[PDB]
Amino acid sequence: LKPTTFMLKYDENGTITDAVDCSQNPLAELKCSVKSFEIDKGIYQTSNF
Amino acid sequence: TQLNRALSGIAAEQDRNTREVFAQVKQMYKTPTLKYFGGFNFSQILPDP
Ligand SMILES: *[C@@H]1O[C@H](CO)[C@@H](O[C@@H]2O[C@H](CO)[C@@H](O)[C@H](O)[C@H]2NC(C)=O)[C@H](O)[C@H]1NC(C)=O
Ligand SMILES: *[C@@H]1O[C@H](CO)[C@@H](O[C@@H]2O[C@H](CO)[C@@H](O)[C@H](O)[C@H]2NC(C)=O)[C@H](O)[C@H]1NC(C)=O
């Protein structure tokens, strides 16, 4: 177990249906920012380096 | 996070303010070699190639 950051989507009944690692790749580092799973075309802003 | 959304929100309108002025032009025309259109001299207004 490692201390990373996950985003979780809950259903209508409080069941975890899907999850995203916020430290896997830059695409999934983006989904944790806007709080969505499907993200439109453009430049979005993420964390700085 | 909230500060960089504010300044990049300001910065994005500085592209929109410039496109709504100069980019009213569908097509690029060539520079005419003629510069006295009836004696009206136009070398100072056209770009000097
Ligand atoms: C959340 O749980 C409820 C149960 O309380 C689900 O509702 C039932 O779903 C079954 C199968 O779809 C139906 O046959 C029942 O008629 C439903 N009952 C009611 C009262 O709605 C519901 O589908 C669950 N939702 C999610 C997203 O898991
Ligand atoms: C438009 O006016 C300009 C004024 O600068 C004229 O340019 C000069 O013309 C003289 C004589 O033709 C030349 O000796 C200079 O070298 C020119 N200067 C430059 C910067 O080019 C130009 O001839 C005029 N054009 C027309 C069509 O009337």
From Swiss-Prot, chain B:
Q: How the protein is affected by changing A12V? A: In strain: Isolate SZ3
Result when mutating A23V = In strain: Isolate GD03
Q: Which residues are glycosylated?
A: N41
Main function: Mediates fusion of the virion and cellular membranes by acting as a class I viral fusion protein. Under the current model, the protein has at least three conformational states: pre-fusion native state, pre-hairpin intermediate state, and post-fusion hairpin state. During viral and target cell membrane fusion, the coiled coil regions (heptad repeats) assume a trimer-of-hairpins structure, positioning the fusion peptide in close proximity to the C-terminal region of the ectodomain.
What is the protein name for this chain?
Spike protein S2
Q: From which source organism is this entry? A: Severe acute respiratory syndrome coronavirus
**What is this organism's lineage?**
Viruses, Riboviria, Orthornavirae, Pisuviricota, Pisoniviricetes
* Gene label: S
Which portion of the entire protein is included? Answer: 743 to 791 of 1255
